[PDB]
Ligand binder design. Structure first.
Ligand SMILES: CCCCCCCCCCCCC/C=C/[C@@H](O)[C@@H](N)CO
Ligand SMILES: CCCCCCCCCCCCC/C=C/[C@@H](O)[C@@H](N)CO
Lengths: 58, 268, 283, 62, 283, 62, 268
């Protein structure tokens, strides 16, 4: 279900330090990592419906 | 090639101009469509078209901008940005109608000790949001078209309050792609990422895109070139580093119709 | 050859791996998305896939009648000092948000248009008098044609313009319209202007709205109650349902993330913070 | 002029392909209903718009 | 090959018997039922059987429109202080007993659903004013979609959701719905929970209802009167008839012997004595 | 696309098999009516679910 | 491969776990023998064996240790080290007999400005020397088997002197491989060297080795994983640098016999 539901729950996605980010001198000890999500060719959706991500109060 | 050839090292040649690069992340061809001339089956204007070829279909280098910890992003519009570029701008202004593709080459080098990621995006019909909350679609022709120097994005939306004498210009907020939609999704659009640790630049080959076979290049801008810092510039320990972002662009398979006297726009 | 309703690709049995091949590793910088599948990063079993993308196809996604406007007309008592109220609506998909947001997932579009009209009426005054069954006249006035100035002036003759004479209480009115655009495809977005500001010519003259093409894209819908003034006043409402059929779309875009503010892409102060608070390390 | 087609059958009764008949009453294509007999295409032009075709098993950057 | 409507097996002529064969004798302990027939325990004549089990087939048994709910909506006078009453019903076959008991003769089920809507209206006040013919809007709101908060808020646009615009006085509305279950078959019974109570985690958090799966199985039916507020108040009722077509059923069960008590198998004190007094040796 | 079938005829008039014609208007199976052309099956899986097949003339337990 | 493929870049996949590496010095297969199930011709225990497959034959990551100028070395024993690892440890304890191979992946990255060499060795029947000079072969089961956290080597042999209440544990001296033989020769054993300037890690594929076709996994440890600093850790100029050494291991073609009630060892 396209909503928060105990019965149809997907599980947990977590990230960790296997070893540790190592850098030499004269270099920034802090950096940013960007993350992207997309669907595999086995992916599909059904039961067309109106979304809550947009509205017209008035 | 066991012979030497590689994805990172390219050589682009158009007319009398040639671009070389030893650190590229391959190249992108918008919607898998390589620029092309207007076909007879799809043609509209009946008059013999003007095809400048090498005189206009070459590489023009715009004014180099500076990337810093503070930078929120930069934007340009085509053909607007090339309007004053040699024979291409001349032919664009002398004709009622005109169509053109582009080879966009964004240059930005640094060092193995620098950090940062430039999100380079090619957006069809890149309509931007205005600076007014009392009125709409009010951004003036002069302000909507910065020419070669282009415009820039803001981390914050600050409404034009001078009702009497309106700034009549754009207020493009970075995280909203300057147009009411979330930046994180800008990737559905033809693009490339300039990740300092991986590559010097971004090469995008753009086709002529539009609801019409050919249109008014002076009244209408087909493509929008948006460059935003996905990951902020950062160096060794310097609190205020800096690196240049040079933008070189070349018109392609471009052609023009409806020839008459030169168009002298009110650009100020 | 691949049909929208064909079963998606079957998951193939995959065993262990100790090779020089690196599917999991890549470089998003190139502008491309890693074509990976479960069997590339983990040991998978053989699965015969029955699922389909039938309902997510362009036609299927829009194959639904959506409300684009609510027109208000009326039929007062002859005596009233105020004019018999007849409706004039400038045709468009932007007066409402739902359908507009869906169409806007894309730059250009092409399609035969199906317009369905739901008409509801009611009494306005704590009166008791009644009214005979009303007959509405929905006239289509294309850009250039004489726009009606009175619930009963010469224009309602519709000699050339297309008019629908709807009878109250009967199955909601419906008509089809071809791809009528003066362009090879509808433009959900126009990054330019209808005019070129010429130096040599006075500022105010060369001026025009940003992102706005034909001042009058598709003309207007002029609705009225054909019946003569009735002693007891009756107010009616015409709900217009728009459905895009035989549709095609080009150049995808990121959905509208913040409250619509007018016919253009303009956003308004106080509505720019869609996303809610949620910690980096909290499930 | 009758157009006969196949229904992709979901939940079958305790009751071989099933068909449905369609006939066009109007002269104008616009008047016609939606076939829903539509085609899929490969995302390539959007997910992999790169000049040099990419092989997933090998190094994206080489 | 055997059709539901084929004539049952003919009774064969059977004479006397003095053998070592013992059909009449058996052992129910094994879990099986003695396949015996009249000719096994008595002298029978030859009979050509014409009778059929046609009407007792799964489809035939349920091939009937059954009332699953009664929705109440209304349209008051603009002035009234109280809100225009629009109905919101959570779709299900358990609000009523008849159809539920029939479906429950089995553990799992599968079928295309046919919903028929019977709409009746009436006047509430000893008034005398009248009201123009009403037009109802039956909107289907699937789990996740913006549920309506006002008889006239933005949600009624139904850009994506399926809506039925019914006109009073006309043949009762009707629509068909496929097998929409997120499972390979509808579960008349779920011997478990939607959540797993984890020690390491606070009691109240891991808690959930017994026998209850998806908090929101199939969304809801949102009904309203499209017509604007009318001087004279008119109350309407929407009766929903549910019919299971193209149906299949698995794992049979003993019919509900005592008064239903909620959506689950729960029984209530004072209702546990169905059977009546009747003596062992009395005909 | 017309589907012609036989009616199992009950009370015949003082008036050879009789037939009825059926045609599907919609693209979705769900929209279709009930065929009623259903099949019977042998109760075995419920009346005799035992591992070792049973012969009625012989001793159930042996 | 002119196509891109290389010795330094690998991708290992077992069950639901996948390991990637862009800086490897190839991989080693002990005695040229790839792990395998027990053949009928060589089989002993007559009962239908238990083969967990993907449930146990996957990658378990042990507790990450810290490498410093002071470190003398680390040691582990198989299967002991994996005894508490998900379904693999469960199946190992429920059965009298068990046999298993391993894919040992030692991870240790740094920087082009760091120095040092980790000698990673796979030793069959790695019997270690005790802490006592008054008695022998006295090291207790609890101390001989550290489990996941493993043990460590000492630059000096210091005898347990408490005759009354003996420490009853190992005193493995680095230069003597903790067992009476010269470290310089440990290389006759299946191994790889993690030289900071050349590679991030070491991958050793170990086969089931032993005087028997199958044995008691709880009583006996088939392989010993020894990691010693051939060349001391060193960075830029920092007097006390540090880098993590993460050890990830995966059981292979593993199988079990003699099923009964779970074995609850006295591990303390
Ligand atoms: C009696 C009823 C007659 C109905 C006549 C309707 C004809 C007009 C239909 C115009 C269709 C407009 C659809 C939306 C187009 C917009 O997206 C444009 N701004 C884009 O090009
Ligand atoms: C405009 C009208 C649209 C009508 C939309 C109806 C769609 C929802 C139908 C849900 C069918 C539910 C049938 C009963 C299922 C229950 O037995 C479940 N608890 C068992 O899985």
């Amino acid at each position: 279900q396209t909503i928060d539901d105990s019965f149809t729950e997907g599980g947990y996605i977590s990230v960790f330090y296997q070893t540790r980010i190592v850098v030499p001198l004269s270099t920034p000890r802090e950096m940013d990592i960007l993350g992207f999500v997309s669907a595999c060719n086995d992916f599909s959706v059904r039961l067309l419906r109106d979304t809550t991500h947009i509205e017209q109060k008035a | 090639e066991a012979c030497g050839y590689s994805d990172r090292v390219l050589q682009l040649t158009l007319g009398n101009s040639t671009i070389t690069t030893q650190e590229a992340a391959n190249s992108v061809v918008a919607y898998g469509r390589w620029p092309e001339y207007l076909r007879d089956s799809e043609a509209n204007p009946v008059d013999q078209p003007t095809e400048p070829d090498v005189a206009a279909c070459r590489f023009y280098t715009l004014d180099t901008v500076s990337w810093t910890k503070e930078s929120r992003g930069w934007w340009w519009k085509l053909p607007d940005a090339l309007r004053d570029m040699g024979l291409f701008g001349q032919n664009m202004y002398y004709h009622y109608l005109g169509r053109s593709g582009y080879t966009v080459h964004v240059q930005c080098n640094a060092s193995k000790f620098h950090q940062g990621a430039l999100g380079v995006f090619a957006v069809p019909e890149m309509c931007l949001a205005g600076d007014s909350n009392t009125t709409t679609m009010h951004t003036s022709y002069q302000n909507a078209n910065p020419g070669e120097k282009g415009g820039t994005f803001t981390g914050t939306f600050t409404p034009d309050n001078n009702q009497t004498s309106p700034a009549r210009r754009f207020c493009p907020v970075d995280y909203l792609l300057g147009n009411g939609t979330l930046l994180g999704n800008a990737f559905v659009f033809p693009h490339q990422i300039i990740n300092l640790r991986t590559n010097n630049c971004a090469t995008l080959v753009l086709p002529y895109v539009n609801s019409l076979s050919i249109d008014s290049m002076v009244k209408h801008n087909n493509w929008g070139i948006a460059i935003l810092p996905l990951a902020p510039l950062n160096f060794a320990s310097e609190s205020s580093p800096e690196i240049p972002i040079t933008l070189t662009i070349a018109p392609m398979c471009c052609e023009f119709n409806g020839l008459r006297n030169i168009t002298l726009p009110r650009l100020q | 050859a691949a049909t929208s309703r064909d079963a998606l690709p079957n998951t193939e049995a995959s065993g262990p791996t100790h090779s020089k091949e690196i599917p999991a590793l890549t470089a998003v910088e190139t502008g491309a998305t890693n074509p990976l599948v479960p069997s590339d990063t983990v040991q998978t079993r053989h699965v015969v896939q029955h699922r389909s993308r039938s309902e997510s196809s362009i036609e299927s996604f829009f194959a639904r009648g959506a409300c684009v406007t609510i027109m208000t007309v009326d039929n007062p008592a002859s005596t009233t000092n105020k004019d018999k109220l007849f409706a004039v609506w400038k045709i468009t998909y932007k007066d409402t948000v739902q359908l507009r947001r869906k169409l806007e997932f894309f730059t250009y579009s092409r399609f035969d248009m199906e317009l369905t009209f739901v008409v509801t009426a009611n009494f306005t005054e704590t009166n008791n008098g009644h009214a005979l069954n009303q007959v509405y006249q929905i006239m289509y006035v294309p850009p250039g044609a004489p726009v009606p100035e009175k619930w009963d002036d010469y224009t309602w003759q519709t000699s050339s313009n297309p008019s629908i004479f709807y009878t109250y209480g009967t199955a909601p009115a419906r008509i089809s319209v071809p791809y009528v655009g003066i362009s090879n495809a509808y433009s959900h977005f126009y990054d330019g202007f209808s005019k070129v500001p010429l130096k040599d010519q006075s500022a105010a003259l060369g001026d025009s709205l940003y992102g706005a093409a034909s001042l009058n894209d598709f003309g207007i819908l002029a609705v009225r109650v054909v019946n003569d003034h009735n002693p007891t006043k009756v107010t009616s409402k015409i709900r217009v349902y728009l459905k895009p059929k035989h549709i095609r779309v080009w150049c995808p875009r990121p959905p509208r993330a913040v409250a619509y503010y007018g016919p253009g892409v303009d956003y308004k102060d106080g509505t720019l913070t869609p996303l809610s608070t949620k910690d980096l390390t909290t499930y | 002029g009758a157009q006969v087609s196949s229904q992709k059958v979901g939940a079958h009764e305790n009751s071989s392909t099933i068909n449905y008949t369609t006939i066009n009453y109007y002269r104008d294509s616009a008047s016609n209903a939606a076939s829903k007999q539509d085609f899929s295409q490969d995302p390539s032009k959007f997910t992999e718009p790169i000049k040099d075709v990419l092989i997933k098993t090998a190094p994206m950057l080489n």
